[PDB]
Symmetry: C3
């Protein structure tokens, strides 16, 4: 535990290179001095056959170190360039060849730009879509006993830890929340347990949001005790 | 070393979801467009039984990805909500169900709010409390020789690496510091070594702070050589 | 994959301590209250023999958690101190002794300042320097066929994925780029393949930059197909 070792020197070295690369101030005192600091990252300033570049003042707005593999670090970069004057926001992937000598780091050649790749998945089957459209086969009198219990549960859940402890196992109260409404309830028996799949509305500051729950309910006296609580409803919820 | 592989795509995907979730601009062109980008994170936009939510403009101020386990990412979140107009700062825990398909990621259902949990430890025994209250059994003449040596040590420590090298093994000088005072010294023999437990005051810019040291001192000529330096004093320091 | 476990509670605990340590507001309501929050990090507020410190208002500008080892966390810190009034930017290394009790954390004693250490490597042999100075032994008629092909390649590379797919294996187009010029070409046979070591200039927004490439070219009809593309030129490129 407390004796674990972490070394983030490489990740922060690469962050410092990205900052040095995408940062160019306006005033010359500042500008050539920032270029010297950028050049300090290389083993050797890369050999460039062009006479020079067109350079505009620029500010780094954001960077994400997404991958390191095979001595290449890949970033997502957001920056702004002042063209003399208009300011333009730009994004690019940015790829840094680097290496290590005696536990120290350097950039080993000209970096390269790439198109940002999204890690967003797509192409899902409609079989994977949760819809809370099922109607359960539990009595209207059990529904009304469960609804009364759930209103007490969510009131305690948003207010009072000791009140919540009496009716639930190892559930923490939430902060800065008001319980508004129960919007869906599907009930299913599992031997002596009653399973409740529930959606409810909460207000935090001035904003409302909905959340899902799976309650495992045991009968206690004339009410219930929550032996288990989850914060998702599974696709198979209405498979009884 | 330099060929290590790092993949942070999941951590930054989740950061981008938190930003998309807690960011809502004022102007409609911007607002519905930010909602579309938020919706792009889901496999399917979650089924919500309420007609709609009350939504206010909001800005993300800070987020910490504290845990990922069992396909749930947990954040500490700081944001501000503009209620039309007053601005209110809010904090919450925020829990994201997600999954992975073919090396890509998605949010799999309604996230849930939780109370922020502190990782601060408490309930310590007074046995664990360091107090620099002990009086050593070393002569006043050794104390004065050690005090003179320690003033040279701390002067060099704050000034001159080559001067420091003559009187200490593998100690680096500190930058931007002035040595002010030695505030505590406990001396103890360990065979031929003299151990010095020391607190001293330093000034950095306009501010003073105290630090602790454990010196291991060897006799060199009519003075000392520091064979070892630590930056803590142990609870057992006055167990001779 | 999606079931991986991450725990960053220690790293963010230490970030919160650094923020608490280097943050001191102006107004007393705020100031003594920030000191109480700072003191909450310790198992016990450290025993300090000085009567007190000189404290000035201060803001944390940046911090990097570079190492954790042997119950010491080491940071690079940037802050600013208001001396009453002038503002001064300062940098320091900052070292935190900490420990863990029952999965929770605490700071165990007085932290210590250190000089920032750069992870920049130096002292390279000129043998390791890439210079694009070699002249190849390939015919001027092959050079002109390759130059025409490379202008098509870089046009597609900056424009049209489907056009690029016809002439290259698994190469992604770049975004927001205009191809300007080929500035260096070294050609070498490798059995039936032709290797091209190339530098080219690109414009992104208002700014130009150079990049290096190693193409592996197969003959296709009266032109070429790129079977492999790298974004570096190796030191041995002109060893035929």
């Amino acid at each position: 535990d407390a004796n674990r070792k972490y070394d983030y020197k490489l990740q922060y070295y690469l962050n410092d290179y990205v900052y040095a690369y995408f940062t160019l101030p306006q005033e010359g005192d500042k500008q050539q001095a920032q270029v010297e600091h950028l050049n300090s990252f290389y083993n050797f300033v890369p050999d460039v056959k062009a006479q020079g570049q067109v350079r505009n003042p620029s500010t780094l707005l954001d960077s994400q170190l997404v991958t390191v593999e095979g001595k290449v670090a890949t970033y997502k970069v957001k920056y702004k360039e002042m063209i003399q004057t208009e300011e333009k926001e730009l994004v690019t992937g940015f790829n840094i060849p680097f290496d290590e000598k005696e536990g120290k780091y350097y950039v080993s050649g000209l970096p390269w730009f790439s198109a940002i790749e999204s890690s967003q998945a797509g192409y899902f089957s409609e079989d994977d879509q949760l819809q809370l459209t099922a109607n359960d086969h539990v009595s209207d009198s059990q529904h009304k006993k469960v609804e009364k219990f759930l209103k007490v549960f969510f009131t305690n859940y948003t207010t009072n830890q000791d009140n919540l402890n009496l009716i639930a196992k190892n559930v923490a109260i939430v902060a800065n929340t008001t319980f508004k409404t129960i919007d869906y309830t599907y009930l299913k028996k599992d031997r002596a347990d009653l399973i409740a799949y529930v959606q409810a509305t909460f207000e935090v500051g001035g904003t409302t949001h909905s959340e899902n729950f799976t309650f495992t309910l045991s009968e206690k006296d004339k009410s219930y005790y929550v032996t288990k609580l989850e914060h998702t409803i599974p696709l198979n919820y209405a498979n009884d």
